[PDB]
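Hi W., the chloride ion complex you wanted:
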Amino acid sequence: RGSFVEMVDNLRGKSGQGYYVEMTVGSPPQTLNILVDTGSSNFAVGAAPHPFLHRYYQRQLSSTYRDLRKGVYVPYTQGAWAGELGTDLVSIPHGPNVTVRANIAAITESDKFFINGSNWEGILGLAYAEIARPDDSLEPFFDSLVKQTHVPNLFSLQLCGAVGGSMIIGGIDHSLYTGSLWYTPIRREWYYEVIIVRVEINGQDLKMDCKEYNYDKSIVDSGTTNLRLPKKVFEAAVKSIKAASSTEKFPDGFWLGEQLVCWQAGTTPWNIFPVISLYLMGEVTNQSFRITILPQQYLRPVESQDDCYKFAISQSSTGTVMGAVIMEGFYVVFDRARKRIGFAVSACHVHDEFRTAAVEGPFVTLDMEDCGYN
Ligand SMILES: C[C@@H](NC(=O)c1cc(C(=O)N[C@@H](Cc2ccccc2)[C@@H](O)Cn2cccn2)cc(N(C)S(C)(=O)=O)c1)c1ccc(F)cc1
Ligand SMILES: [Cl-]
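Structure:
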């Protein structure tokens, strides 16, 4: 097919509990399934038995492992782990045709980090060194890949929800999207931080000051399931989504992610729930564009003749997190060489015969440089 064909369809996800790619570490080779996380910057692998791991990295069998004689601990919003730093050879067999010596944290203990049944045994933090632990001197995997090889400084993700998808490393594959790509600047290289300049629920502007949508940051994060919104924005958005979906009433806990609602298999009334649009700053002064997701992205299946769903927009106290809810609508291009992130409608996103996810523009939006937090 296109020149990156052998990286298409290189991601899997088991019951929707994270998308992961196979990575092969050490010598002789040990291949493990690695969750792709654009919200963090450590490459870390299970390296000791755990009840939720089928396999783990055995350093003593790899002749090329080098111990860096330093511990590392990483806490996330969900979960934490502790382990030991070293370096070893790493290749991605359905990724670029190169092998690099990368830092690797060997996870030896953890709390609420591994997910039973998820089939992944480590994490690949693809964001930048500023947020790596123990500190920014520990080079992240993608930085090593670009410094040691010819691979261009860009990767792109198509996360296909319900689970699989593609991680194209070093380019873009045009089969994975339709329409045009539209780009927003990476505001700052730490997380993949972006600026959200307007939010609409079924065409209706939420009308908050744009500084509320980015307080205290907005990031794109493939290792977080939900669209997470700061408190005032979440409360406002729920009020508006309730109002829009008012031909059916749901208990208050459903909008808090505490109750599920189930429909008989195949009857979910998608049409009653609104589309949600986020407008992002564009590449030209005063220009923006909008990405629009469907309830097939923000109502997530929980795995009888019953389709059960959880509402997967939730409250955050650390800014807007555009997680898998947002990314499953779109092919997302992390164009680190041009400090920008591109969105296009994904060729695999879940939709129905009446509505599809969309990426549209340009719009005119003034004073966008004021939306960001300082
Ligand atoms: C793998 C699974 N992920 C979740 O279940 C999940 C993970 C986190 C979280 O902290 N993610 C960490 C990395 C990590 C990866 C794996 C385990 C723990 C943590 C970094 O990305 C952000 N981070 C950096 C510093 C602080 N935080 C938060 C939440 N929520 C808080 S939620 C419920 O979505 O609002 C839910 C998944 C399932 C389906 C998918 F399509 C995609 C992902
Ligand atoms: Cl097209």
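The CA atoms of residues 79 and 113 lie 4 Å apart.

W.
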